[PDB]
Amino acid sequence: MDSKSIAAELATRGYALVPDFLTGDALTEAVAAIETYFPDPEVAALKHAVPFPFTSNALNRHPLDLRVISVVEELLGTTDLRMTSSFIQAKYGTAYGESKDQRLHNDAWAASSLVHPRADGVYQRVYGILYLTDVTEDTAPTYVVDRAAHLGVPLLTPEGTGAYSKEAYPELYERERPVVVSKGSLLLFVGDIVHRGSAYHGHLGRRLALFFNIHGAQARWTDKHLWSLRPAHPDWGTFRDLMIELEPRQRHLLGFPPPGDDYWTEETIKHLSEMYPGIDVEPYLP
Amino acid sequence: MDSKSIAAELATRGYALVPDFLTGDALTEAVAAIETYFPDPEVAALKHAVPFPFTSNALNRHPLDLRVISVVEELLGTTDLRMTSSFIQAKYGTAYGESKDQRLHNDAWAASSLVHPRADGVYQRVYGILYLTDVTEDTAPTYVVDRAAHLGVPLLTPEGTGAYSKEAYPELYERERPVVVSKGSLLLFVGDIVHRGSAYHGHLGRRLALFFNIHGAQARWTDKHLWSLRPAHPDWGTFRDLMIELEPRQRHLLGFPPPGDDYWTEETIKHLSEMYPGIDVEPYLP
Amino acid sequence: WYGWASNDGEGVAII
Amino acid sequence: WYGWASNDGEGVAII
Ligand SMILES: O=C(O)CCC(=O)C(=O)O
Ligand SMILES: O=C(O)CCC(=O)C(=O)O
Ligand SMILES: [Fe+3]
Ligand SMILES: [Fe+3]
Ligand SMILES: [Fe+3]
Ligand SMILES: [Fe+3]
């Protein structure tokens, strides 16, 4: 991955497809991990997205991949980043119920809509979809158009959302194009791109994907990803091991206090070692 | 309310009860508002807490009351505050099913437990419970002990939580005391206080309360309150009106960009006026 | 809908 | 339990 090249494509076209983002054992392990949640149906509750953190670090580590961080840093012009959201989801074929197309929309907004988005600099949002099955035109491909400003459409429509009806925005639907991709490919896109998910045309099978999005902390009304966990929880061990494996630049996206932060004292270094035995505290020592 | 006096009681004892925080029409309107959600049962789904924002600003405005902000600013030593959570809840009597006591616990932790809490300065958390019914010993009073450090108990127990079992911490249960309060009273407490909810002993009726908690933005791994809303939503009008009514110091707790923030430009001032017609933009003009 | 938090007008939503 | 988000070991939890 060439961070500057990918960030330039995001800026100009709104999206970039990275083939072979995962290969080898990393791909095999990620596929196995997501299949623990969404097994080969060969289901109602299994249509729901499952939020981070997952039961396997073969999924948890990917939204924080150093290559992804590098792209986002180049596009936004800041290193002060946060993971906004991450989840896994399966989209099932027609044998498992009616599958519908989403409306074209942007994802430029924070969840609360507290203030209107900006599509420039540190206010941009970057989305990723890591496909863990081969995606064809009959397995619910993502559709993309272009950045909203390039298309001359507003981020807030007259209907009061970031979605574009077919009756009001016909040209968007004529220009949309599907993204087909091999398993292990990563689609990156900016939140202000006009895009949608699509219906899974095929009868059997399901599309498997890991989703995430990242924002700059300067957009302070935006929430980072919310989850609840305590050391007593059965899933804590996996998360604890994730924190030990991550480098400081990656933990930063979870809101971890950075080197030099006032949080760090002899007592909090001690408590960090207690909660995450084996963690490297040297970057944080006062 | 005397902010410095209340903050001193919070620092020394861990809690302070403010009688008559709401009086007059403000109290009557808040009671009516919460009763739209939890009517006089004279219910299963009605036992669930409902999160902010509410359908009435007679509830939404209270976690942001200037008097509450002043207390928290004095205790934490910073004005860079965020609302962590707010919700309303009813606790029903025994006629509506078995009511149980919570274990004593602290609420010193962020939801993700990402790093261990600090109970000093800007890392303190402040909780409020605004009681909207009269609370007696038979209507599920809050129980309090004292700050964890004062009691010599850890914020992380050997069980891996912030809760204190009766078998491991018997002295805490012998020292706990109920808080009785008239309707319109506000209980404030620090997150590191050992406390619990209790069973509603009475057969009929329910306790009504509005809950909120606030933290300092320096504790950057902590999440501010998460909600989803867009201008198309039926509840947007109420929230829009709330934003117009609030002063800058209050909007700050929602993550609103402060005066002088790089977010503010001619274009974003325009978009702010469009989304919140009538809002005073003068504090934010570049 | 098909998420884990808030509501999309049907059930819990992606956030 | 008795909340709106995540899980307390029974159903959705207060957060
Ligand atoms: O599932 C998809 O292909 C697209 C979903 C979408 O709109 C997004 O990831 O923001
Ligand atoms: O409901 C209550 O009285 C107390 C609940 C509690 O533990 C809290 O508000 O943190
Ligand atoms: Fe452009
Ligand atoms: Fe989208
Ligand atoms: Fe003390
Ligand atoms: Fe509590």
CA distance D11 to chain B (A): 10
Alpha helices, DSSP H, located in chain A: 3-13, 24-37, 57-60, 66-76, 148-151, 170-175, 236-245, 248-251, 266-275
Alpha helices, DSSP H, located in A226-265: 236-245, 248-251
Pairing of strands B126-131, B206-216: antiparallel
Residue A211: count of CB within 10 angstroms of its CB: 19
Q: How many angstroms does the Cα of residue A143 sit away from the middle of ligand 1?
A: 8
The conformation of residue A123, written as its DSSP 8-state character, comes to G
Residue B265: count of CB within 10 angstroms of its CB: 12
Contact of B99 with B140, CB cutoff 8 Å: yes
For tokens 């020292």, what's the residue? Answer: B175
Q: How far apart are CA B193 and CA B126, in angstroms?
A: 10
Contact of B150 with B112, CB cutoff 8 Å: no
A185: left (phi over 0), alpha (psi -120 to 50) or beta: beta
- List, in order of start, the domains of chain A with CATH numbers: 3-221 (2.60.120.620), 225-286 (no CATH)
Ligand number nearest CA of B99 is 2
The conformation of residue B277, written as its DSSP 8-state character, comes to T
| Residue from B225, B226, B255 nearest B243 by CA | B255
Residue A184 tokens, joined = 């292990």
Distance of CA A268 to the CA centre of its chain: 31
Q: How far apart are CA B93 and CA B100, in angstroms?
A: 11
Amino acid at A123: Y
- Establish, for the pair of chains B and C, how many residue pairs have beta carbons separated by less than 8 Å: 9
DSSP B81-142: EEEEEEEEEEEE-GGGS---PPPPB---S-TT--S----SGGG--EEEEEESS-B-TTS--E
Q: How far apart are CA A109 and CA B8, in angstroms?
A: 41
Amino acid at A256: F
| Residue from A224, A229, A280, A211 nearest A252 by CA | A224
Question: Which value in Å is the resolution of this experimental model?
Answer: 1.5
Pairing of strands A193-196, B177-179: unpaired
Residues from A contacting D (CB-CB < 8 Å) are 226-228
A41-58 as b/e, with b when 16 or more CB fall inside 10 Å? eeeeeebbbbbbbbbbbb
Q: How many angstroms does the Cα of residue B61 sit away from the middle of ligand 3?
A: 41
CA distance D2 to chain A (A): 15
Residue B32: count of CB within 10 angstroms of its CB: 13
- Residue of C2, C6, C7, C8 to mutate when probing chain A, most A C-beta within 10 A: C2
> What order do you get walking across the sheet with A193-196 strand by strand?
A177-179, A142-147, A193-196
Length of chain D in residues, anyone?
15
- Which residues lie below 8 Å from residue A176, measured CB to CB, with a gap of 6+? A104, A143, A144, A145, A194, A195, A196
Contact of A245 with A223, CB cutoff 8 Å: no
Residue B155: count of CB within 10 angstroms of its CB: 17
- Which residues lie below 8 Å from residue B245, measured CB to CB, with a gap of 6+? B57, B61
Cis peptide leading into residue A53 (ω within 30°): yes
Separation in Å, CA B254 to CA B205, B215, B241: 34, 11, 15
Ligand number nearest CA of B161 is 6
- Chain A residue numbers with beta carbons less than 8 Å from the beta carbon of C15 are 85, 111, 226
| Residue from B14, B11, B27, B4 nearest B182 by CA | B27
- Chain B residue numbers with beta carbons less than 8 Å from the beta carbon of C6 are 226-228
Closest-CA residue of D relative to B102 is: D1
For tokens 């002990």, what's the residue? Answer: B145
Q: How far apart are CA B25 and CA B186, in angstroms?
A: 16
- Chain D residue numbers with beta carbons less than 8 Å from the beta carbon of A228 are 5-7, 13, 15
Contact of A281 with A273, CB cutoff 8 Å: yes
Q: Inspect the interface and report whether the beta carbons of C3 and A48 lie closer than 8 Å.
A: yes
- Which residues lie below 8 Å from residue A26, measured CB to CB, with a gap of 6+? A58
| Residue from B173, B156, B2, B174 nearest B74 by CA | B2
Q: How many angstroms does the Cα of residue A12 sit away from the middle of ligand 3?
A: 6
Residue A136: count of CB within 10 angstroms of its CB: 15
Q: How far apart are CA A105 and CA A176, in angstroms?
A: 11
| Residue from A239, A215, A209 nearest A83 by CA | A215
Instruction: Name which residue sits closest to atom 7 of ligand 2, judged by CA.
Output: B196
Q: How far apart are CA A148 and CA A106, in angstroms?
A: 8
Contact of B107 with B125, CB cutoff 8 Å: yes
Contact of B135 with B207, CB cutoff 8 Å: yes
- Chain C residue numbers with beta carbons less than 8 Å from the beta carbon of A87 are 3-4, 14
- Which residues lie below 8 Å from residue A253, measured CB to CB, with a gap of 6+? A63, A64, A69, A81, A82, A83, A214
What backbone torsions phi and psi does residue B182 show, to the nearest 5 degrees?
Answer: -80, 155
- Chain D residue numbers with beta carbons less than 8 Å from the beta carbon of B111 are 6, 15
Q: How far apart are CA A186 and CA A181, in angstroms?
A: 8
Burial of D9 (0-12, 13-18, 19+ CB in 10 A): exposed
| Residue from A187, A101, A102, A192 nearest A146 by CA | A192
Q: How far apart are CA A155 and CA B271, in angstroms?
A: 11
- Which residues lie below 8 Å from residue A25, measured CB to CB, with a gap of 6+? none
CA distance D13 to chain B (A): 9
Amino acid at A113: S
Pairing of strands A177-179, A15-18: unpaired
Cis peptide leading into residue B53 (ω within 30°): yes
A-contacting chains (≥3 CB pairs under 8 Å)? B, C, D
What backbone torsions phi and psi does residue B192 show, to the nearest 5 degrees?
Answer: -85, 0
No. of helices (H) and no. of strands (E), chain C:
0, 0
Pairing of strands A142-147, B15-18: unpaired
Contact of B131 with B141, CB cutoff 8 Å: no
Residue B166 tokens, joined = 């009766």
Instruction: Name which residue sits closest to atom 2 of ligand 2, judged by CA.
Output: B197
Burial of A167 (0-12, 13-18, 19+ CB in 10 A): exposed
- Could you report how far apart the first and last alpha carbons of chain B are, in Å? 35
Q: How many angstroms does the Cα of residue A174 sit away from the middle of ligand 5?
A: 67
Length of chain C in residues, anyone?
15
Ligand number nearest CA of B142 is 2
- Could you report how far apart the first and last alpha carbons of chain C are, in Å? 10
B160: left (phi over 0), alpha (psi -120 to 50) or beta: left
